Every structure is written in structure tokens, then in C-alpha cells.
Design an enzyme around this catalytic site. Structure first.
Site, PDB file in Angstrom:
ATOM      1  N   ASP A 175       0.800  -1.107  -0.067  1.00  0.00           N
ATOM      2  CA  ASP A 175       0.080   0.073   0.082  1.00  0.00           C
ATOM      3  C   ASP A 175       0.687   1.270  -0.014  1.00  0.00           C
ATOM      4  O   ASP A 175       1.922   1.491   0.579  1.00  0.00           O
ATOM      5  CB  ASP A 175      -1.061   0.048   1.156  1.00  0.00           C
ATOM      6  CG  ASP A 175      -2.034  -1.057   1.118  1.00  0.00           C
ATOM      7  OD1 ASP A 175      -2.679  -0.794   2.124  1.00  0.00           O
ATOM      8  OD2 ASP A 175      -1.849  -2.036   0.645  1.00  0.00           O
ATOM      9  N   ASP A 200      -0.783  -2.849  -4.461  1.00  0.00           N
ATOM     10  CA  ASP A 200      -1.985  -2.960  -3.563  1.00  0.00           C
ATOM     11  C   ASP A 200      -2.839  -1.373  -3.503  1.00  0.00           C
ATOM     12  O   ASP A 200      -2.213  -0.549  -4.330  1.00  0.00           O
ATOM     13  CB  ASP A 200      -1.869  -3.316  -2.326  1.00  0.00           C
ATOM     14  CG  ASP A 200      -3.377  -3.975  -1.745  1.00  0.00           C
ATOM     15  OD1 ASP A 200      -4.050  -3.220  -1.174  1.00  0.00           O
ATOM     16  OD2 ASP A 200      -3.468  -5.074  -1.695  1.00  0.00           O
TER      17      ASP A 200
END
Ligand SMILES: *[C@@H]1O[C@H](CO)[C@@H](O)[C@H](O)[C@H]1NC(C)=O
Ligand SMILES: *[C@@H]1O[C@H](CO)[C@@H](O)[C@H](O)[C@H]1NC(C)=O
Ligand SMILES: *[C@@H]1O[C@H](CO)[C@@H](O)[C@H](O)[C@H]1NC(C)=O
Ligand SMILES: *[C@@H]1O[C@H](CO)[C@@H](O)[C@H](O)[C@H]1NC(C)=O
Ligand SMILES: *[C@@H]1O[C@H](CO)[C@@H](O)[C@H](O)[C@H]1NC(C)=O
Ligand SMILES: *[C@@H]1O[C@H](CO)[C@@H](O)[C@H](O)[C@H]1NC(C)=O
Ligand SMILES: *[C@@H]1O[C@H](CO)[C@@H](O)[C@H](O)[C@H]1NC(C)=O
Ligand SMILES: *[C@@H]1O[C@H](CO)[C@@H](O)[C@H](O)[C@H]1NC(C)=O
Ligand SMILES: *[C@@H]1O[C@H](CO)[C@@H](O)[C@H](O)[C@H]1NC(C)=O
Length: 549
Positions: free
Chosen positions: A338, A357
Site C-alpha cells: 500500500d 495494492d
């Protein structure tokens, strides 16, 4: 004498080198070494272009697994590598790129393609005149003969990526003055004691540093500033213990987590977490008490994060705010890599994200994010805002260019603007149950403008209204091309949702779409499903989605 690298250190140009640079494409480089690209050589010359001197610019290299082959299983399984180089400048500079020596003169595509930088071809070299900009540039140089096909997407991308990060010089706010008695400049090698130092400023000067795959940079509560100098390469992850009004990480040096296995858990001796406890070591971690705190992240390059790139600790997360600029995340081949959290009041600009992600996490109010280049890999949407129902308002995401995408299937929760299911009941973000929403929360006044997807792309949007939606407008968004239809990744959808307790239908209001083009086709209401591939809008919301011209 024996050839030596020659770096620039003047008021117009600054490049650097690493004498412990190691060419290695299969195993972990030595501790005091830095993985260096054996394919791309870069030299920079301040204009006007003359027979004058060209200065060497170290080309870094990140590979999937970080040389740990028993770690590849946690990547998407592609053989792509990511090389990059950074330099500081204050005037137009010509960037000379050279390869192998058996390489023929191949055409190159610069991404974002909007740059339109001057490009010359001369004797197995590419000359790119990079214009000066107070915000610098972050771009990909892609050699046609280096393009491969990523299955099952068929996405044509560089097998060996080369990123160029041209940044402006550092000012008094991003570069500490040398010799302050309240700062500590650890010497090259294993770094120790920063977690109990009385210093308030950690300074990493040119050189290689490393914590291990079993330890990270925990800074004492006294530390409020961490500087990574241009020419500095630090293997580790940072965590501030300070709860002061401001903690800062700046400099154009590198912070690499190549030594940590995927999902390395600090509490389990930096070993792969026992059972997806969401405790994978973050590259940026902090903590706040009762007082608000501002996190300043500037110029740094983060590479090979072993998990989510960033997260702060606390029950008062809304008391944190971020100010990030000229920041990059490269070599993020592992899953769940992320991008940053952007807490309330955040202002993020001129960022480059390589991520497998959730990219832009729209989980907080009053956020401004602009001038972003994203190399989305295979999982999660470019923009996410659907794991937990929340009250979010006043968000602006402007000028975002997803240069690549390589999704595989629907289970990847693809899409430019997405909002997956409720993780409490559908941890993987995908489920038919749309009755776990909260009709008492609302996400309003959201503006996503000037988005652009080069190459094949996933669906414009796949939004699960887990809370009400109001005043969300998409302005100017172009999708060069859609990924193969057979993979279930190009159709946009938005199914009706229901309150978890009340059963009350989740509402959607004033969801406008303006300036949406797919290839050379300007989309409109009478074009939505045809070209735009917008088929999944629930009939209950159809009246709320407006295609304004
Ligand atoms: C030149 O750059 C080096 C790093 O490459 C830096 O340490 C040094 O301070 C610079 N020289 C000066 C003071 O101009
Ligand atoms: C890397 O993968 C691509 C397809 O994704 C393939 O064409 C290429 O040959 C692979 N690299 C090599 C030379 O093994
Ligand atoms: C400080 O960091 C060292 C390095 O791993 C660690 O061994 C030690 O327990 C830490 N001490 C503190 C502040 O808890
Ligand atoms: C967002 O900003 C508005 C006005 O500036 C303020 O009233 C609101 O409390 C802010 N929200 C958060 C969570 O900071
Ligand atoms: C709505 O969000 C925008 C962000 O572009 C902000 O400028 C504006 O002040 C917000 N208006 C409201 C409803 O407070
Ligand atoms: C999921 O939806 C079902 C209805 O099919 C509902 O009974 C359930 O409470 C929802 N969430 C869960 C699995 O708790
Ligand atoms: C929405 O608010 C009502 C009234 O307070 C409450 O009964 C209901 O449980 C809430 N819905 C959710 C999703 O919690
Ligand atoms: C939308 O694109 C047009 C055409 O380039 C431009 O003039 C306009 O300012 C853009 N609007 C936004 C939301 O910035
Ligand atoms: C793609 O979606 C279609 C219809 O939703 C479905 O029939 C097909 O099995 C899916 N393809 C796969 C297996 O990913």
C-alpha cells in the site's frame, strides 16, 4: 588512471555514486553494498549542451524477492525489474542513457507521455532534455525492444524499467545544517543506538547504512527529524517514538527494506508473521498521544517495502496530518505494498508510486493530492475508499497518471476508482452481500480530476456504497485502452447497498462524470455502456449518475 565515476556538485547539478555498488540480479547484495543496474548507465549535463562534461548518476536496481528466491511466491511472479536514478538540479539538464554495448538503437517512450520532453538518438544513447521545474519530474524511460507481455493482461511494459527522478535542490527545511550539537550522524555500516539517542535530528550522510532483516530504525522520542542525504542508501524502516507536534523525514537519499522478508513482524523477530496479523513492518510508522502531529515526508525514495508502506498508531488518528512532496516508492513487487496513509488535512504532491495494492487511500477528510504518477501492479484499485464505512468529506485528487496496470482477474478488485466490500465480513474485498453498510455515514464533496491511464486499463470504477455517497465528481479522465474483456476487469459497477442493522438502502447522490474519454472516443450518457464499458450501475442509482458535458 583507472576509470572512476565523476559526480556533479555545483549550484546547477548534483549527482552521486556508490563505490560499493554491486551488479546482482539474483541474490541479496552484500550488507555494505548497493544493487546497481548492469543494464542502464546514466549521465547528466546542465544545458546548454556542449562538448563539456557529463556527470555520472548512479542507477539503482530493485528486483522481486530482493534476491531471496524463496520469497518470490509473494510477488505476482513477473520477471520485471525496476532501475532508477535521482539527481538534484536548478537548470535544464540533458540526461544521457546508455545500455549494454550490444544494444541496437531502440525507440523510447517517456511516461507520463504528457511530458513531451526533447529526445535525441545518438550512437546507442538516448538524450532526454529534462526542463527544470521547482517540483522536478518523475518519469519512466521505456525501450521498445525491452517491452514484454504480462499475462493474462497482455499489458505491454518494460521488462527492465528505468525511472528518472529529477528533483529540485534541498532547502533549509529539508536539509539539516552540518555540525549541530543536537544531531547525530551515524557512520556507515550497521546502525545502532538511534532508539535511545538524545539527538532530535538523525543525519545519514553519503554512504551505505543498514539495520538487519531483524531490526529497524526505531527513533527515540527525542528524534523529530530524519535526513537521508543525496548519495545515502539506508537499508531499514523508520518508526518515530516522538509525539511532538511534528516529525520529519527528508532528503533525496534512499530508504530500502530489501533486507526484510515479506510481512516481516517486529514482534516475531522480524520473521514472516504467523498468520496475517496485519503487523507487517511499515516503512513509515509513527505514534501520537493527545496532541496533534504533522508528518513531513520530502524528497525521499522508499524501495522494496515488505508490507503496507505506512501507518501511524493511536486512537486519535484524526489528529495526524501529512505534508509530502517529491516522494517515491519503487521496487514494491510484494503484495499488500500500500501507498501512504493521508490523514486529515493532508497535502501530497509530486509523488511516484509503484504499488501492488491500494494506492491512493481516500480514508480521511480535507485531503489534497496532486501530480502523481502511479505504476499500479496487479492488485487493488488505484483509488480505494471501501474497506470500512466512514464519514469522509472535502477531498481532491488532481492530475494523477497511472502509467501502467497489470491486473489479472476480478478477485484483484481492479479499477481506477474503487471501494471494495466491508473487510469485517469480506476480508478479501469481494462478496455478493451488500447489506453490511452504514446508512448513517456519508462520503461527500469528492473531486477526482485529470486522471489518466496509459496502456491497457481496468474499469473506470467499481464502487460498493458501504456508506452514502454525495457530490462526487469525476472531471477529465482518459483511458487509452481497456484490458482484455475476458479477464473481468474493464466493466465498472455500483450495486445497491443496505444498512447492516436498519436495512435502510444506502443512497448515492450527484455522482457526475465529465471529460471521460476512452481512446479517441468522448463518452456521454448515450456512450456509457457502449465504449465506456459502464454496465454495472445499479438501476436504483442510475438516476444519480450524471454524464455532464
Ligand atoms: C557535494 O555533494 C556531496 C555529496 O555528493 C556533499 O556531501 C557535499 O556537501 C557537497 N559539497 C559541497 C559542500 O558543496
Ligand atoms: C519475462 O516474461 C516475459 C513475459 O511476461 C517473457 O516474454 C520474457 O521472455 C521473460 N524473460 C525471459 C527472457 O525469460
Ligand atoms: C534499542 O534498539 C536496540 C537495537 O535492536 C534493541 O536491542 C534495544 O532493545 C532497544 N532499546 C529500547 C529503547 O527499547
Ligand atoms: C475538515 O475541515 C472542516 C473545515 O475546514 C472541519 O470543520 C472538519 O472538522 C474537518 N474534518 C476533519 C476530520 O478534520
Ligand atoms: C469541497 O472540496 C473542495 C476540494 O476541491 C474544497 O475546495 C471545498 O472547500 C469543499 N467545499 C465544502 C463543501 O466545504
Ligand atoms: C451478509 O449478508 C447476509 C444476507 O445474505 C446477512 O444475513 C449477514 O448478516 C451479512 N453479513 C454477515 C455475513 O454477517
Ligand atoms: C444507523 O443509525 C441508527 C439510529 O441511531 C441505528 O439504529 C443503526 O444501527 C445505524 N446503522 C448502522 C449501520 O449502524
Ligand atoms: C478539464 O480538461 C479541460 C481540457 O484540457 C481543461 O481545460 C479543464 O481545466 C479541466 N478541468 C479540470 C477539472 O481541471
Ligand atoms: C468472468 O465473468 C463472467 C461473467 O461474470 C463469468 O462467466 C466468467 O466465468 C468470468 N471469468 C473468469 C473465470 O474469471
Amino acid at each position: 588512471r583507472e576509470f572512476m565515476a565523476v559526480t556533479a556538485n555545483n549550484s546547477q547539478l548534483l549527482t552521486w555514486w556508490h563505490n560499493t555498488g554491486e551488479i546482482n540480479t539474483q541474490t541479496p547484495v552484500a550488507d555494505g553494498n548497493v544493487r546497481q543496474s548492469g543494464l542502464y548507465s546514466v549521465k547528466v549535463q546542465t544545458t546548454p549542451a556542449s562538448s563539456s562534461l557529463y556527470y555520472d548518476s548512479f542507477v539503482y536496481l530493485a528486483i522481486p524477492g530482493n534476491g531471496m528466491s524463496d520469497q518470490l511466491q509473494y510477488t505476482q511472479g513477473y520477471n520485471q525489474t525496476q532501475a532508477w536514478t535521482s539527481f538534484l538540479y536548478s537548470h535544464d539538464a540533458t540526461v544521457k542513457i546508455s545500455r549494454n554495448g550490444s544494444s541496437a538503437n531502440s525507440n523510447v517512450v517517456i511516461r507520463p507521455t504528457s511530458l513531451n520532453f526533447p529526445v535525441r538518438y545518438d550512437n546507442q544513447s538516448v538524450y532526454i532534455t529534462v526542463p527544470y521545474s521547482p517540483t522536478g519530474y518523475r518519469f519512466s524511460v521505456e525501450f521498445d525492444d525491452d517491452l514484454i507481455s504480462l499475462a493474462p493482461s497482455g499489458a505491454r511494459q518494460p521488462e527492465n524499467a528505468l525511472l528518472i527522478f529529477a528533483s529540485p535542490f534541498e532547502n533549509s527545511s529539508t536539509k539539516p545544517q552540518p555540525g549541530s550539537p543536537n544531531s547525530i550522524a551515524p557512520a556507515p555500516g550497521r546502525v545502532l543506538g538511534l532508539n535511545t539517542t538524545s539527538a532530535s535530528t538523525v543525519v545519514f550522510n553519503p554512504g551505505v547504512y543498514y539495520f538487519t532483516g531483524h531490526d529497524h530504525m526505531v527513533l527515540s522520542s527525542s528524534v523529530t527529524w530524519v535526513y537521508f542525504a543525496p548519495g545515502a542508501y539506508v537499508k531499514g524502516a523508520v518508526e518515530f517514538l516522538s509525539t511532538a507536534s511534528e516529525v520529519k523525514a527528508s532528503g533525496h537519499g534512499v530508504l530500502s527494506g530489501e533486507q526484510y522478508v515479506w510481512y516481516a513482524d517486529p514482534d516475531e523477530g522480524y520473521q514472516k508473521a504467523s498468520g496475517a496479523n496485519n503487523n507487517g513492518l511499515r516503512m513509515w510508522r509513527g505514534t501520537l498521544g493527545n496532541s496533534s502531529q504533522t508528518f513531513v515526508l520530502n524528497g525521499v525514495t522508499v524501495s522494496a517495502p515488505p508490507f503496507n508502506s505506512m501507518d501511524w498508531s493511536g486512537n486519535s488518528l484524526d489528529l495526524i496530518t501529512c505534508r509530502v512532496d517529491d516522494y517515491k516508492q519503487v521496487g514494491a513487487f510484494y503484495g499488500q505494498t500500500d501507498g501512504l496513509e493521508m490523514y486529515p488535512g493532508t497535502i501530497l504532491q509530486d509523488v511516484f508510486y509503484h504499488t501492488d495494492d491500494d494506492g491512493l487511500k481516500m480514508y480521511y477528510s480535507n485531503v489534497t493530492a496532486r501530480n502523481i504518477v502511479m505504476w499500479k501492479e496487479s492488485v487493488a484499485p488505484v483509488v480505494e475508499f471501501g474497506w470500512t464505512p466512514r464519514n469522509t468529506e472535502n477531498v481532491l485528487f488532481d492530475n494523477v497518471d497511472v502509467i501502467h496496470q497489470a491486473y489479472a482477474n476480478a478477485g484483484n478488485n481492479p479499477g481506477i476508482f474503487g471501494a471494495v466490500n466491508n473487510y469485517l465480513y469480506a476480508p478479501d474485498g469481494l462478496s455478493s452481500n451488500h447489506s453490511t453498510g452504514n446508512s448513517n455515514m456519508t462520503v461527500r464533496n469528492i473531486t477526482w480530476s485529470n486522471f489518466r491511464a496509459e496502456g491497457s486499463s481496468s474499469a473506470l470504477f467499481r464502487i460498493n456504497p458501504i456508506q452514502n455517497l454525495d457530490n462526487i465528481s469525476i472531471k477529465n479522465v482518459s483511458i487509452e485502452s481497456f484490458e482484455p474483456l475476458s479477464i473481468n476487469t474493464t466493466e465498472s459497477w455500483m450495486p445497491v447497498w443496505y444498512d447492516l442493522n436498519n436495512g435502510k438502502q444506502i443512497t448515492v447522490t450527484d455522482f457526475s462524470i465529465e471529460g471521460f474519454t476512452v481512446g479517441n472516443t468522448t463518452i456521454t450518457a448515450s456512450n456509457a455502456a457502449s465504449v465506456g464499458r459502464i454496465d454495472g450501475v445499479d438501476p436504483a442509482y442510475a438516476g444519480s449518475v450524471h454524464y455532464i458535458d
